[PDB]
Structures are given as C-alpha cells and as structure tokens.
Amino acid sequence: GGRTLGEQWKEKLNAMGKEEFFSYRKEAILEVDRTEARRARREGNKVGGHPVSRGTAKLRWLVERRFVQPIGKVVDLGCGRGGWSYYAATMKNVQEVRGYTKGGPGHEEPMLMQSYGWNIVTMKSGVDVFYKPSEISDTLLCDIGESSPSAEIEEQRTLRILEMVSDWLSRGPKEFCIKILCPYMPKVIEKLESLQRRFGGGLVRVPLSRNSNHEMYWVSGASGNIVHAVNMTSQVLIGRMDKKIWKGPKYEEDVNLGSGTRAV
Ligand SMILES: CN1CN([C@@H]2O[C@H](COP(=O)(O)OP(=O)(O)OP(=O)(O)O)[C@@H](O)[C@H]2O)c2nc(N)[nH]c(=O)c21
Numbered sequence: 468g469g470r471t472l473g474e475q476w477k478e479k480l481n482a483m484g485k486e487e488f489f490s491y492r493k494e495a496i497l498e499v500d501r502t503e504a505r506r507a508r509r510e511g512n513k514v515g516g517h518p519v520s521r522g523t524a525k526l527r528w529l530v531e532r533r534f535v536q537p538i539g540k541v542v543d544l545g546c547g548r549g550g551w552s553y554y555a556a557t558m559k560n561v562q563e564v565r566g567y568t569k570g571g572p573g574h575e576e577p578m579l580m581q582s583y584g585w586n587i588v589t590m591k592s593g594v595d596v597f598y599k600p601s602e603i604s605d606t607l608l609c610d611i612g613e614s615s616p617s618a619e620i621e622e623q624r625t626l627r628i629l630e631m632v633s634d635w636l637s638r639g640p641k642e643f644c645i646k647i648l649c650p651y652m653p654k655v656i657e658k659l660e661s662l663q664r665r666f667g668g669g670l671v672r673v674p675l676s677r678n679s680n681h682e683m684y685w686v687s688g689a690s691g692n693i694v695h696a697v698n699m700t701s702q703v704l705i706g707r708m709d710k711k712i713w714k715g716p717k718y719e720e721d722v723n724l725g726s727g728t729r730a731v
Pocket residue numbers: 480481482483484485488492614615616617679680
C-alpha cells in the first residue's frame with residue numbers, strides 16, 4: 468500500500484531545478500559516442516556501419532547479455548529510423564525484419580541503410596501500430612513510450628502499449644523485447660505480472676537510459692520478481708540524485724553494423 472519508490476523518484480525529479488536536472492539526467496549512465504555516426508549521417512554514408520540512432524546500442528546491450536535472441540521473422544513496432552530493425556538484420560538466425568513506424572511531421576522516418584543484412588529489412592512508415600492488426604512473428608520488438616511529467620499519463624500510455632503488445636504476443640513469438648515506459652505504477656505492475664505469467668520473461672534496466680526516465684525492457688530472456696527488479700532501479704536512480712560532484716556518463720564505443728547483403 469501507499470506510494471511506490473518510483474513515484475517518489477518521479478516527484479523528486481519534477482522538483483529539481485533546471486541546472487540540477489540536466490546534470491542529473493546523464494549522471495553515471497552509459498553513453499555511446501555518436502560523433503562518428505553524426506558525421507556519417509550528414510555525409511550520407513550508408514556503408515560505414517554507423518547505427519541510425521542510439522537505440523542500436525540499447526538493443527545491443529540486451530542481446531549481448533542474452534536477454535533476447537532475435538530469430539526468424541522479426542517485427543519491430545515503432546521502428547523510427549530503424550536502429551533496432553537494422554541491428555536485428557545482423558543476427559545469425561534472423562530471416563526477415565518488418566518495421567512499422569508512424570513517421571510524419573515531428574517524428575522519425577525510416578532511414579535507408581546498407582548495414583549488413585539491409586536487404587531483409589522492410590520498414591513501413593505512416594503506420595499507427597495501435598490500429599495495425601497483429602501478424603505472426605518469431606521475434607517481437609517494441610520501443611514505443613512517450614514521456615510525460617505526469618506518472619498517471621505515463622501509466623495510461625504504458626497500459627495502452629501492453630494491451631497492444633499482448634495481441635502480438637498471443638501470435639506466437641517466443642523472443643521479445645518491449646519498452647516499458649512507466650514500470651513503477653501499481654496498475655502497470657499488475658499487468659506486467661499477468662503478462663509475465665502468460666508470456667514469461669522479465670524486466671531489465673538498460674544503463675544506457677537517462678536517469679530522467681524509468682524505462683525498463685520486458686524481455687523474454689529475463690526472469691524473476693518484477694517488483695524487486697523495478698524497486699532496485701528506483702533505488703539506483705534516487706541514489707544518483709543531489710550528488711556532491713557530478714561524474715557524468717561513462718562513454719562507450721558505438722555498435723558497428725558493417726555492410727553487405729545476407730543470403731535469403
Ligand atoms: C525538461 N525536463 C523534463 N523533466 C522530467 O523528465 C522527464 C523526461 O523528460 P526529458 O529529460 O525531456 O526526456 P524526454 O522527454 O524523453 O527527451 P528525449 O526525447 O530527448 O529523451 C519528464 O517527464 C519530466 O518529468 C524535468 N524535470 C525538471 N525538474 N526540470 C526540467 O527542466 C525537466
């Protein structure tokens with residue numbers, strides 16, 4: 468009963484001043500150096516192995532730790548420029564990648580790249596996934612979740628995604644990676660515990676995430692108590708607040724996606 472630890476985190480966050488907030492945001496997080504990829508983007512370099520976004524490094528973190536092992540037909544919901552879609556197209560047992568994203572003004576259009584296995588990637592823009600009828604996949608990825616200063620608004624947004632994701636999961640995919648925008652709210656916990664009982668997996672925090680969000684990833688390769696996993700992350704995020712001296716992020720090399728087509 469009562470307020471959850473994550474709720475205290477969000478309140479404290481919302482109570483920070485401008486200066487404190489931006490220092491906190493990146494404190495002791497993992498960050499990939501995107502310098503080379505940004506210069507590649509503006510040079511139109513499609514063959515250098517540079518990921519289209521920071522999302523590639525996030526998925527890389529999870530896959531290298533076996534939290535998800537993409538296979539067969541991969542469906543990527545909210546693919547954006549295609550960071551997750553392209554990364555999956557480099558996996559050994561992936562046969563097809565299908566991405567869906569809304570695109571349009573203010574939102575990311577899929578980028579056409581020549582990273583390894585690009586020829587098995589098909590991203591369709593102009594697609595609102597909440598109105599897209601589910602399809603069969605072997606791997607389901609979903610990276611949707613728009614932040615709000617309101618934990619109530621984020622709760623509802625998370626619950627809408629989980630309802631949507633549940634429909635795609637009943638379709639059979641045994642591998643999955645689903646962004647949980649607001650995992651600390653009681654209603655979201657209850658749904659997650661229900662979905663874990665049916666579909667398995669567990670919640671993991673990726674350290675590449677900023678301290679200004681509590682996003683966790685529901686992944687098939689994880690297991691264990693959801694509440695404990697969430698509270699631990701709440702503790703780490705709160706412990707990083709009001710620091711004496713800011714250490715900032717730990718920088719890491721970006722993912723290399725290579726080039727070339729793969730056999731079909
Ligand atoms: C700009 N913000 C954002 N913010 C809190 O941090 C949360 C995430 O905001 P953010 O850091 O802008 O991340 P996001 O919106 O995802 O931006 P991006 O898409 O660049 O990742 C908000 O929901 C809000 O609770 C803030 N809290 C305080 N105290 N002061 C601030 O200036 C801000």
